[PDB]
Amino acid sequence: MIVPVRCFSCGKVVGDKWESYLNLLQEDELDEGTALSRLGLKRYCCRRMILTHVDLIEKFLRYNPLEKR
Amino acid sequence: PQNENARAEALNLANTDSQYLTPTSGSPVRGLIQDHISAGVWLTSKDSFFTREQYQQYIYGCIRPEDGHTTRSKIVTLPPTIFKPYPLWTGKQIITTVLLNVTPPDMPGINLISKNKIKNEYWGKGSLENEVLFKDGALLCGILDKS
Amino acid sequence: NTLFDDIFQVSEVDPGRYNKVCRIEAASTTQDQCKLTLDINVELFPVAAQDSLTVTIASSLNSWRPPQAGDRSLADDYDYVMYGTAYKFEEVSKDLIAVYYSFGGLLMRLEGNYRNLNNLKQENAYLLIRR
Amino acid sequence: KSLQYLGSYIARAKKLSRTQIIFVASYLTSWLNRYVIEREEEVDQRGGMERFKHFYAAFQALCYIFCFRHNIFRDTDGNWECELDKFFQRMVISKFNPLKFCNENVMLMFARIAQQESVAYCFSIIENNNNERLRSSWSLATRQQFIDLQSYFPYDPLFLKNYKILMKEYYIEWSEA
Amino acid sequence: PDREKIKLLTQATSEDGTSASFQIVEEDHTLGNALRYVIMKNPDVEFCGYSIPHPSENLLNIRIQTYGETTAVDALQKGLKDLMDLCDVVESKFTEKIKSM
Amino acid sequence: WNVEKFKKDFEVNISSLDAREANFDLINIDTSIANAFRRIMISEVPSVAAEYVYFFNNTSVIQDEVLAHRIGLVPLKVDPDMLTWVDSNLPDDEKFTDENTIVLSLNVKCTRNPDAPKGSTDPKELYNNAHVYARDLKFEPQGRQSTTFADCPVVPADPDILLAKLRPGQEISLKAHCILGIGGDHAKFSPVSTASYRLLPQINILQPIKGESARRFQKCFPPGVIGIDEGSDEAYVKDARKDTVSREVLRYEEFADKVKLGRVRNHFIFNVESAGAMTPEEIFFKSVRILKNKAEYLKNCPITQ
Ligand SMILES: [Zn+2]
C-alpha cells in the first residue's frame, strides 16, 4: 500500500526513498536501475523493494469520507 | 483412546510400525523419497570421502543413541579406509557404521546380494556399482537407491 | 607381516564420471600373468599412465587412533595407505586366481598365479602404495 | 513419612519420659548399626544412593532427635547413651555419606550441635560434599520427592491461636530445647 | 546457580566416566559446532560430536569419549575454557588492528 | 593446534570503515567461528526498537496494528548500553522504568489548506500535514532521562521514512514504548541492514595462457581481476579480491581445462551494514564479546547430574 519501511531481506531502511525515486525518474529522467543505485540500493534484495513498489495508497486516499466532494 | 485396552490395541495391532508390508501383495509401503534418494546416490558414490571429523558427525547426527536403541551405550566406529597419507572414510562406511550401531550386537551382520537402478556403464569402465553387496553387515560395493 | 608386493606399471587411469577417484589398470613388471585394477583417491595420490607403483598388501602394520608423539609403523615407508576387506576369491583358470578387495567402496581386483598370491586370505588387509 | 513423624514426635512431645526417648534412640542406632554392617558393601556395587533412601530417612530422624534432646543423652557420668559420640562419626564417615543426602538444614544443625558436644565432626565432610557439587548419584526425577518428604515435619509449631495455647503443656518450642 | 541448563544423560554415560552425553538447553549449532571443534583438539578425546534432536525443541546434545587419561566431564571443561580463551585471542587481535588502522 | 599458534596466524584486514558500513577480512580463522560472529551480529546483538504502541486515536486510512508495525521497524538512534532490560514478570506499572523504556509520542491532525495554488496536485500545498514522517516521533524523556539523554535526544536514524498519509479531518495520536530486544526474537531488533561474509576468491591457472587466449580468458572475469603481462604475454591474476565468482570461465570449453576456482579457504570477507544505532565495528565487537560470554557463562555453570 504505502512504501515499506525496511527491505524484507536486508533490514535496510527503504521508506525514505520512495518520494525521491519518483523525482529521479521524473525530473532527472534516469532509468530505473540508475536511480536505484543513486539512492544506495545495492543488493538486489533492496533494489526490488523500490523498483516494484505499487503506491496503491494514493488510490485509497481518493475516497475520503470526511470531506464534501 | 480412553482406556488401557484401547491403548494396548493401538500400540500393538493398529500401530504403524508392523505395517511395513501391505496385505494386498506383501510388499513394502514405507520408504524414503525425493531428497533422500538423490542424497543416497551421492553419499554412497565411490567419489565420496569424509575426514574423521565429518564421519563422526554424520554418525551422531543420525543415530540418536540417547534412545531405546541402546544396542550399546557407546557409539562404535570403523577404522578409516585410507590410513595414509590422510585418514579418510567412505560413504559406504557411513552406512555400515549406521547398521552396526542399530542392529543387535549378539547377532551377525546382514548378508545381501542385490541390484540398484543405475547401470554400471553410467559410472565408467569396469564399474560394478550396480551390484549391491552387503557382507557381514558392511556395504562393500554398490550405491543405495530407490530400490 | 607382509602378504604381497610387486612393482606395477600403470596402463590406464580412468576418472570415470567422478572427480576425486580414478580407476587404474596396471600390470606387473615381474610376472607376465599378474595384473591389477584399483580405485584410488587421485586427489590425494595423483597417478598418470606409465607411472610405476610399488604395491604392497599386508595383514598388519609393525585399533586406529590419530597419530601421536613418535608413532612408528609400516605406513611410514609408503605414500598412500588404505584399509579394507577381501570379499571374493575366484578361479580364473587352472593356473590363475583373482582376489577382490573393497576399501570402503574403492575396489581392487588382483589377478595372478596361485603360488604368487598364496598368502592372501579372506580377511581384512592394508594396502600400501609408493611411487 | 512415618520416620519424619517419629523424629518430629520424639523431639516435640513434652510429656515424654527420658527412657521412652532413649528407647527410640536405642531402636534407631541399633537398626542403623545393622544397616551399615550388612549393607555398606552394596554401595560400590551397581545401583545408586537412592537404594538407601530408608537409611538416610532413619538417620535423619535420629539426628533430628539429637538436635532437640541432646542434653538428655548424657548420663550421670557425662557419658553418652548409645555411645552417640562414637556412633555418629561412624555413619558420617560411612560410604552412605548421610550428610549429603539428608535434609540440608538438619544436617547443618546436627553438625553445629554435634561438633559443640564433641560428639562428631562433620564440617569437613560437608565442605567436601558441596565442593564435589560445584566441580553417589541419584536421578532427581525421584530425588526431589525425597527432599520434599525430608523437609516436612508434622509437629513443627502450630499457628492456630487457641490450639497453640492448649498445646503448650504438651509442646517443646525450639527456644526451649 | 542454574541447574536446568546442562544435564548428564546417564543412560549413555559409562561407569568410568570416560564417556558421556550432555543435554544443553537454549543452544543450537552456534555453540555446538564451535565447542566440538575445540574439544576435538584435545588429544585425549577419542570421540566427539554434537546433534540437535529437533529444530523445535531448544536442545543440544554433546557426546564425549576419552582415551582414559581424563574423564568426559574434564574434556567438556577444557573445551569450554579453550573456547573462551580462543575468543579473547580474537577480541585482542581485532582491537589491535582497529587501533593500528 | 594451540591458542598461541592461532594468535600468531590470525590476521585482520580493514578494507573500508565508515559510520554505516564496514568491509574487512578475517584471515586464518575457522568457518565455525566466522559463522558464529555472523549469526550473533544478525540475531543476538541488542538494539532499541518500539515494542508497545498505545493508540488514543487513529482515523487514518492505515490500520492501527499496521501503523504500530512500521513504527516498530523504525531504527532508533539510541545507544543500547544506555538502557537496562525489562523484566517481563512484573505487572505493567512496575515493568516500565526510566532505565527500561523510552517513550515516543506522535500527534498529527490533517486540515485542508485554503492558500492552495488553484489546480494543484501536490499534497504539501493542498493539505497541512498530509505526510507523516519518522522524524515526527517526538522524544518524551521520563524521570532521570531528562538528564541522561540531554546530550543525545532520541531521533530515528532515518528521519525521512514515510510513516503514514492523511487527508483533511483525520488524526493520529499514539505513544510508543521502546525497549531492548534481539533480532532472534524479532527482526526489528536486528542492528544490521545486514552482516554477511564471502570466502575469498582463489583463481589459479593450471598452465600459462597467452596471446588471443589471454585476452579471451581475461574477459571471463570482471575488469581488473585478470591481468595480461607485457613480456611473457601470459595471463596472471591481479586481484582476486574484485572477483564475483560468476564461474563464467567454466562455460567456455577452451578454458574449463586450464583453471581451478577456489578460495583462500577460511579467509572471510565480512561486510557489515548498520541499521543506524551503533557503528559496524561496535556491532562486530559486541558479537565477538557475546560469543565469549556464552563460553564463560557456561564454564561457570554447575553441571547437574
Ligand atoms: Zn533490499
Curated annotation (Swiss-Prot), chain A:
The keyword Transferase appears for this protein: no
Any one GO biological process: transcription by RNA polymerase III
Gene Ontology annotations for the cellular component aspect, listed alphabetically: nucleoplasm; nucleus; RNA polymerase I complex; RNA polymerase II, core complex; RNA polymerase III complex
Keyword Metal-binding: yes
Covalent link Glycyl lysine isopeptide (Lys-Gly) (interchain with G-Cter in ubiquitin), residues: K59
GO MF, any single term: DNA-directed RNA polymerase activity
Record keywords: DNA-directed RNA polymerase, Isopeptide bond, Metal-binding, Nucleus, Ribosome biogenesis, Transcription, Ubl conjugation, Zinc
Binding site for Zn(2+): C7, C10, C45, C46
Compartment annotation: Nucleus, Nucleolus
Gene3D superfamilies according to UniProt: Homeodomain-like (1.10.10.60)
Similarity annotation: Belongs to the archaeal Rpo10/eukaryotic RPB10 RNA polymerase subunit family.
Record-linked HAMAP family: RNApol_arch_Rpo10
PANTHER family found in the cross-reference section: DNA-DIRECTED RNA POLYMERASES I, II, AND III SUBUNIT RPABC5 (PTHR23431:SF3), DNA-DIRECTED RNA POLYMERASES I, II, AND III SUBUNIT RPABC5 FAMILY MEMBER (PTHR23431)
Other information: Present with 5300 molecules/cell in log phase SD medium.
Subunit structure: Component of the RNA polymerase I (Pol I), RNA polymerase II (Pol II) and RNA polymerase III (Pol III) complexes. Component of the RNA polymerase I (Pol I) complex consisting of 14 subunits: RPA135, RPA190, RPC40, RPA14, RPB5, RPO26, RPA43, RPB8, RPA12, RPB10, RPC19, RPC10, RPA49 and RPA34. The complex is composed of a horseshoe-shaped core containing ten subunits (RPA135, RPA190, RPB5, RPO26, RPB8, RPB10, RPC10, RPA12, RPC19 and RPC40) where RPA135 and RPA190 form the DNA-binding cleft.
Stated name of the protein: DNA-directed RNA polymerases I, II, and III subunit RPABC5
Swiss-Prot record, chain D:
Coiled-coil zones: none
Protein localization: Nucleus
Disulphide linkage map: none
Taxonomy, superkingdom: Eukaryota
Sequence similarity: Belongs to the RRN3 family.
Assembly, per entry: Monomer. Interacts with NOP53.
Other observations noted: Present with 138 molecules/cell in log phase SD medium.
Role noted for this protein: Required for efficient transcription initiation by RNA polymerase I. Interacts with Pol I in the absence of template DNA and stimulates recruitment of Pol I, but does not remain as part of stable preinitiation complex.
Name assigned to this protein: RNA polymerase I-specific transcription initiation factor RRN3
Taxonomic source organism: Saccharomyces cerevisiae (strain ATCC 204508 / S288c)
Gene from which this protein is expressed: RRN3
Swiss-Prot record, chain E:
Signal sequence, renumbered to the chain: none
Keyword Nucleus (UniProt): yes
Subcellular location: Nucleus, Nucleolus
One GO MF term: DNA-directed RNA polymerase activity
Predominant place of localization: nucleus
Keyword check for Nucleotide-binding: no
Chain segments annotated as coiled-coil in the UniProt record: none
Annotated GO CC locations: nucleoplasm; nucleus; RNA polymerase I complex; RNA polymerase III complex
Keywords, alphabetical: DNA-directed RNA polymerase, Isopeptide bond, Nucleus, Phosphoprotein, Ribosome biogenesis, Transcription, Ubl conjugation
Superkingdom of source: Eukaryota
Complex formation: Component of the RNA polymerase I (Pol I) and RNA polymerase III (Pol III) complexes. Component of the RNA polymerase I (Pol I) complex consisting of 14 subunits: RPA135, RPA190, RPC40, RPA14, RPB5, RPO26, RPA43, RPB8, RPA12, RPB10, RPC19, RPC10, RPA49 and RPA34. The complex is composed of a horseshoe-shaped core containing ten subunits (RPA135, RPA190, RPB5, RPO26, RPB8, RPB10, RPC10, RPA12, RPC19 and RPC40) where RPA135 and RPA190 form the DNA-binding cleft.
Family note: Belongs to the archaeal Rpo11/eukaryotic RPB11/RPC19 RNA polymerase subunit family.
Function of the protein: DNA-dependent RNA polymerases catalyze the transcription of DNA into RNA using the four ribonucleoside triphosphates as substrates. Common core component of RNA polymerases I and III which synthesize ribosomal RNA precursors and small RNAs, such as 5S rRNA and tRNAs, respectively.
Misc: Present with 8680 molecules/cell in log phase SD medium.
Name listed for the protein in its UniProt record: DNA-directed RNA polymerases I and III subunit RPAC2
Residues of the full protein shown: 42 to 142 of 142
UniProtKB/Swiss-Prot annotation, chain F:
The keyword Protein transport is assigned to this record: no
SMART domains named among the record's database cross-references: RPOLD (SM00662)
Top-level taxon in the UniProt lineage: Eukaryota
Subcellular location: Nucleus, Nucleolus
Any single GO BP term: tRNA transcription by RNA polymerase III
Keyword Plastid found: no
Keywords of the record: Acetylation, DNA-directed RNA polymerase, Nucleus, Phosphoprotein, Ribosome biogenesis, Transcription
Classification via HAMAP family: RNApol_arch_Rpo3 (MF_00320)
Function as written in the Swiss-Prot or TrEMBL entry: DNA-dependent RNA polymerases catalyze the transcription of DNA into RNA using the four ribonucleoside triphosphates as substrates. Common component of RNA polymerases I (Pol I) and III (Pol III) which synthesize ribosomal RNA precursors and small RNAs, such as 5S rRNA and tRNAs, respectively. RPC40 is part of the polymerase core and may function as a clamp element that moves to open and close the cleft.
Subunit structure: Component of the RNA polymerase I (Pol I) complex consisting of 14 subunits: RPA135, RPA190, RPC40, RPA14, RPB5, RPO26, RPA43, RPB8, RPA12, RPB10, RPC19, RPC10, RPA49 and RPA34. The complex is composed of a horseshoe-shaped core containing ten subunits (RPA135, RPA190, RPB5, RPO26, RPB8, RPB10, RPC10, RPA12, RPC19 and RPC40) where RPA135 and RPA190 form the DNA-binding cleft. Outside of the core, RPA14 and RPA43 form the stalk that mediates interactions with transcription initiation factors and newly synthesized RNA.
Similarity section: Belongs to the archaeal Rpo3/eukaryotic RPB3 RNA polymerase subunit family.
